[PDB]
Amino acid sequence: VNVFRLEMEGITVKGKGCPKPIKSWVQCGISMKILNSLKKHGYEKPTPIQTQAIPAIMSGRDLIGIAKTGSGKTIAFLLPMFRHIMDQRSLEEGEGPIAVIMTPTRELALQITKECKKFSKTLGLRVVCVYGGTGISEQIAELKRGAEIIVCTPGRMIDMLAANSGRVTNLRRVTYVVLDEADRMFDMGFEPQVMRIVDNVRPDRQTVMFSATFPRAMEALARRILSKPIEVQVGGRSVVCSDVEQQVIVIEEEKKFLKLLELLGHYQESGSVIIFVDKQEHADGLLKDLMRASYPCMSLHGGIDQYDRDSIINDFKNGTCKLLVATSVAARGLDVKHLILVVNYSCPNHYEDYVHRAGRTGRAGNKGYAYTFITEDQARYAGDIIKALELSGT
Secondary structure, three states: HHHHHHHHOOOEEEOOOOOOOOOHHHHHHOHHHHHHHHHHOOOOOOHHHHHHHHHHOOOOEEEEEOOOOOOOOOHHHHHHHHHHHHOOOOOOOOOOOOEEEEEEOOOHHHHHHHHHHOOOOOOOOOOOOOOOOOOOHHHHHHHOOOOOOOEEEEEEHHHHHHHHOOOOOOOOOOOOOEOOOOOHHHOOOOOOHHHHHHOOOOOOOEEEEOOOOOOHHHHHHHHHOOOOHHHHOOOOOOOOOOOOOEEEEEEOOHHHHHHHHHHHHHOOOOEEEEOOOOOOOHHHHHHHHHHHHHHHHHEEEEOHHHHHHHHHHHHHHOOOOEEEEOOOOOOOOOOOOOOEEEEEEEOOHHHHHHHHHHHOOOOOOEEEEEEEEEEOOOOOOOOHHHHHHHHHOO
16 A cells, blocks of 8 residues: 555656566565575665666566666666576577677676676576677687677677677567666767667567666657657656745744744745644644734634635635645645645655645746745654655755
8 A cells, every 4th residue: 555655755757557666676576596696785675766677677668767876777777687587598599698788888898797797696697708998809709608698888799790799680689688878878979889789689679778867868869769668767756846945944843833933923924825734633723823823814624614624715715814724635636826835834754745735835837935844753754855855956
């Protein structure tokens, strides 16, 4: 029932027919060797980019993932590919790899080969040992004995394809095409080499691309080579609106009412504002304290009747009530044009309620103000609030 909490963690997902992210590597549909390598490497919890890319690579569809530096994109490209190679074994033909990994640098290709050897440890699968600027005879002797994956330079791959040392057959040769640092491969320098690498490939083969940054033109150039791609970045799915300004202040539980009274008294946050509370009794007490302080305020919660809540909503929409106290039920789905300010005095336990409270004000391209009071008790939601502020650009 907590499938929405994995998507709210902050992982923009785009595409049709996207599988659910896995919580751990033990229930991700991986083989025994990949799980043994993950247990030997010391991975207790998987990365969110890895949890978004591993079912998309296990399902057999094209995926394009973007994340920060050092997030584990090489392991996220090597582990489901090795799991699909171990689960669906094929005949190791001559001079034909089952996977093609493209790296723009020789040191990056050597690091990808070392990561693939560490992910395929305690097994007979040796992928590749080749780099640019070295002896081609040793690389040909290493590739002639058997090659599972092909992680090298595009120039070395073009030289191997021109000298008939390595190529992709038409019927069944490779099933996955990995592209590490796809922003550099889609540039003007590596365009015809990547075009000749993608042209001489099998028709029934998946294409994977991973990079730290991704421009619009590079993504538009890379989307033409893939067939129905699935995008995975951060953050978009269940994220806060960028048009509404978010503010977080560190105050106590008793000082929150004084901060709200100072924002209503000194600043212009009293009129046309929606105040989110934790419970209905606390919202009624805050509404009574606002009405006792010579300020017109209305309240809408589950403890009140439906007609009184409708009258309070009509008074907030018409302009009769300056402030409107509401619970978490009115945070999502409410589309009021008068709600310009969103005062979150009580922080919710879930980030989706805070995202719905921030998105309730300043919609349809308009600006908005959102001020939330962060306390010491909401320490678990502070990381989610920081991730939402980093995704929304606040």
